[PDB]
């Protein structure tokens, strides 16, 4: 179902990749997470000083995979600007939240959710790290995050901006 | 995979032919795969030319709200005006994407079915998303919210004629 | 679907999938379960990169929960005996054969991103005997070699499901550096 | 669909390594996987009858008729076929490994080599005198008497690379570089 | 999966350039029709050069398979047959119907003339035609062929050479 | 399965006015309990029913039919939790007769009711909170607070909370 | 599976003229009710039947065979509700003896019936609304409006609507 | 399938007459609830005679399984435990929670205190309670129990006797 | 559902033969099939602790923990358990057969007896010292040294009834009446 | 569903399924594929009938295409070593183990109905060897014994799928009488 | 779905079996054929001189199984009267045809078909025996049967009586 473009033959995502556009669409997992990392590493290699535009529509997924992407965004040289174009739940909100400071966006009707669900024992811990990371990027107190996450504090686009997950709603 | 000149194969198919003329299809269920495709095509057509109008032909029974509203917003906030043409069925998110078309360019073919009811899809309180939908359906149609809220409650069915008078479309292509 | 990159290289205006493009930088990926299919893709790529140059480093990005011990052994062995240093970089998970593959990288060139998780549990995974699992001792020596750890320590922690964050794996000796910029 | 690929449908890593006369057997030997090896071995022979072939083997074995086809093709064609074990060579896998050119049969050190060949072979009764050509072939390449081969092919014996060198199944164990 | 050659050709396409065709796996309309297409194609390219038909099959459909046999027969170029692995049922017939003096097997192959079930009962005078075909090409008495087909006679490369199913075993 | 006289094991225990709810609360399982409660009412309406509960809950519709049937029959329905009382199980356990609700010490009790069970028609949610509050001796304000999160409880806390009256620690 | 008395638990409650519709109304579930109603009528034609309902409804054809069997038999069919009554469950609840239709407070009654159960021949849906209008006491144009709408009603509202006589609270 | 006795009793029913109960296979609501029913039934028949609880289980659900443990504890009669085959996870706990001096194993059985995954992360202070239970009944230090549970400590009948999981090995 | 049955749910042929203290193991040893034997062995013990039990075995084996449960139950209970092989006794099947009362272990003459015990046993590593109690048990009942048992339990050796008598796995081969 | 027969027998007014009722006349049935489940029902019944009387004949009605060789061997062996003569009667098919079971009946008491079909093909049907199929020789001797036929004749005709009508099986020695009234 | 009767508890077929009524319903196979043989053997044993009523509604099935039943009907002492109560195709017609001379019936609307379909090679032969058996019971020439069977000569109840498959149509 994916169309093709010229300028050479290109699928549409591949064409949009040339303009430094990366997509995450649907659930985060070893396949979808590793392809984002692959595109990010590639775009850094082409130009280490040009911004990348990371469009996110995700109900989240695996934490190991998602944190792989999150780390990669922080530690590549380029600024990864994050746009939410539908949803950003679970790891979707964290990857959104972890975009480059001042370049985190959402469309108005999207739904940002910050609760990280179920998907060895003392090992969470990981959850503490997700709260500490969300607190850095939003600026909230760690306590505020810990109270707000073990509860699916659902938020519209304007509510997420107040909370510090994104920087700008796109009304234009 | 359609009639192909020469999934992610190497070919120039019918949809790739018509994308060169800025035409875009939503055919079938709205979901993460299908919605992201529209949004990808809309972003692509904008970077090619930000002034030329896009022709977004729609035949959907609806589906996911989050993904659907993601398309709606993209239609609104890209510079190019998006024309909408209903070519069979426009229910739930189909009707909202249709009705969300640029002012003056919201078409439907004579026999099409527009249905404006929207079904569900922790939480319960969280479905004030239904109020965001009702505002936007009122904003584009021109109807009152007390009408839109009540009228978008029951499974209301419209032929193209009724969808013009209601305000979901601006014309009906008899010529 | 996998994205596609078009380039030139004094040879032609060539077209690569995103992974083949990164293979030009000597970047191989192991992503997901270690089985025959995925272990031979890795091994294939390592041989290809050696055939192109046996001295330039290889950067092996690992995000695996593990899998087959024989298939992973092939990869581990391939990493040791091709001429170029295989630098390993963990970008999510490295459990079981994955943590052996991560720890089997060149001295001083094993990395992990900060949020990655590493487990050194070596689970049970045609017909052959229990005493014939002296494959288990080889894993434990391979790990004890590469970590700098006492063999008794590796035997104690491998039948324990002992989970570690990135920096803890640094402490234990599974990696050399966590990546912080 | 296929895996790390250049295009101009696509030119995968196995193809790229076939330009270098490198061939794999990965997973169980069957009609599909065995004919692929046979077709590569024939193609490589026709490109250049004199340059060597490098056959990297990771297999639990499988079909005897299919595998014997591969085995036979390796002796038939003009090129020396070097064999390298890169994980498992079991049953037909061990036979194919052991059937590489004299002095050019390698194994990685962690590899497991199992000469036991189990049922099914495919109608089947005493006409599993296929089992006797198996053992003659295995005897010829190893230098073992036919007694020991029959003894050891009917018991599930497991060898690491060094026992496999000792036994004659392979000439070298890659312990370096 | 099938590797590719650049000069993008799949490996069987590239071997087709050298007039080499394969029957691998079960004989059925699809696989039989494929072999027929290749034999047709190669003749139109050159009707005077041999074709090399490598066979690893356990047989299968009689109609489909006899279609392949008939095409081998009635095309101009000699079709030389080489067994690599198994030749059972319609595989052993197709092996045995290669050009005279040009039927081969590699020495570890297994050849089986028995042909099972794969209409009416009286319409297995198709069975009679197969046994004639096998008799003609082997040199054997029809009585011998009919004995050895109802029995599941299993032959190695040497036995098949002695029976007349193939002309040479090659090393 | 198992059988006895002085009848499966569950039928035998139904003579001693004992009823089990075991596993998911659905139209099948709810109705058997309702049917058992009704039968026990007609057999002797003064005497007490002992209702054992080990369930992660299920349907609200099916579950509340059991709740009502406990209240609006003659007998006191004494509840005991013997493993798990989640979702509707918490409520059915909480809805036993006044002063007659028990739990075994290792039991886990969870008042949260998940979405399974459209829109504002989830005012049912307020009837649950009210039903709980009324039986718990706890304010609608904290009851809604706790049912909006995955709030686990041991038998000790459940008693202090109000959900049960006695934790069995003896004979 | 199901317990035993002295009979199985449902048969023993049939000894006291109690009948259950549990889960979906279909050929199988509806015919069991229909056979139980006939049996109770043959045991004593005057005594009241008690018909507990917990259903999301289902097949219109089968569910209307049982609704007719309630009217056609002599015994007054008391309909009690114990959790849910949607689609045919709403109709079978309403179709009980006037003076003897009951519910429990937490129950959820829904008059809406789905699509699944010739096109013009679904004039059957207009018979449905007539029969509801007859048992409720409402005008027909109120019923056709309300059905087609997902209008959820709890026991106190269902009393006001005419769908039921009482609400049990003791 | 289960044979029948006439005196039609199934064989487990007939052994119930001699106060013998089985946990065979995985511990889950169904199987756990069954065991609880039998322990309840046998006490009402006679609260002063021992019960003989034969255990061949690899464990399973913690909630369900602790329900069985608690019932064994708090009923009047001693529940003597006998391991025939396997006692892993909730099986080894249930074995170990039998009456003091009356916990048995046949000499070839395999006993494993390790308990895996089968809510929230903080709600595995259930893990703490299990390790207390195991510590209490074994006589071991909680530190030892916690070491040996996170490890997959596999014990034979003799080792389990030495550890205090059982009181006797019998021949 | 069940098979040739009297009623007064039903009284099948296995029940009718259980009145005669005859017990079967039919098909693979698992938690369901093994506990059935254990429950019968216990029931027969409780009916009458002194009269013998006749255990007719047709099994490819299966689960070691489950089967050892059966094995142990046979030694535990008071009654002599006679074992009769009626087709296959393999792995756990051969162990159960061999674990019958001294002098009361029979086999029909066409039966196949295979002492090879394969994986899976069930987490599993050196804790397959279950394998060492297997061999001690097999050694005790047969009279074979532990060497020979370890040698022969790890190779797929097949015995007809007369080799099984010779080896000590059974005391008698039913050649009459 | 299986029909049910009610009777009396100085014991009670008992109730049998149709097969248990015929078991009172010492009639056992093997119907369909020989496997572990069906071979033990047969063997169970044979032991039961012997336990009731070891001298009264048993009438074993066979309609099977065959199946497992070990399971059928059990039945064949059970037929030889219980004290009462097992008369066999073929009522449809007897192929493979079924024809061995039919032919394994008591001397002079093996029957078939006229329209029955008998094949003596012994097909291939945990892990063990090819030479270990000297089970095949035992079948061939068991058949050569019971048929009166030369062992070479049985070896020739068993790998041939040699089909026979009832009266042909009489000629070959597989049965004694065809039933004609 | 099968009801129960008194006089003792009885399923309906079991009750009807006491009046010497046997049923074959649906496809002929090892299960359904062996149960008819079992009932026939049983009814002979109860009374060897009382007729048995064999009601047949069958599309036929396996020939080995069906010929097992056919033989049993001929060689038990009782006369097996055969009634067709719906269909009697393939082996259904042969079992119908092979009822006791003068006691073979059909209801008027039933459909008798005499073609034996597909379900080693020279082995048919069996088919020759089916034609010879059908010729005995009907009285037709063997040639007539051989021509008429390798063709699905379909027949109503009155046409079957003319042909000799049954003796009487039941119009009363």
Author numbering:
A (entry chain B), K (entry chain B): 6 to 12, 19 to 130, 143 to 195
B (entry chain C): 6 to 11, 16 to 130, 142 to 195
C (entry chain A), J (entry chain A): 6 to 130, 140 to 195
D (entry chain G), I (entry chain G): 5 to 12, 19 to 132, 142 to 196
E (entry chain F), H (entry chain F): 6 to 12, 20 to 130, 142 to 194
F (entry chain E): 7 to 12, 21 to 131, 143 to 196
G (entry chain D): 6 to 11, 21 to 131, 143 to 195
Authors' account:
Caseinolytic proteases are large oligomeric assemblies responsible for maintaining protein homeostasis in bacteria and in so doing influence a wide range of biological processes. The functional assembly involves three chaperones together with the oligomeric caseinolytic protease catalytic subunit P (ClpP). This protease represents a potential target for therapeutic intervention in pathogenic bacteria. Here, we detail an efficient protocol for production of recombinant ClpP from Francisella tularensis, and the structural characterization of three crystal forms which grow under similar conditions.
One crystal form reveals a compressed state of the ClpP tetradecamer and two forms an open state. A comparison of the two types of structure infers that differences at the enzyme active site result from a conformational change involving a highly localized disorder‐order transition of a β‐strand α‐helix combination. This transition occurs at a subunit‐subunit interface.
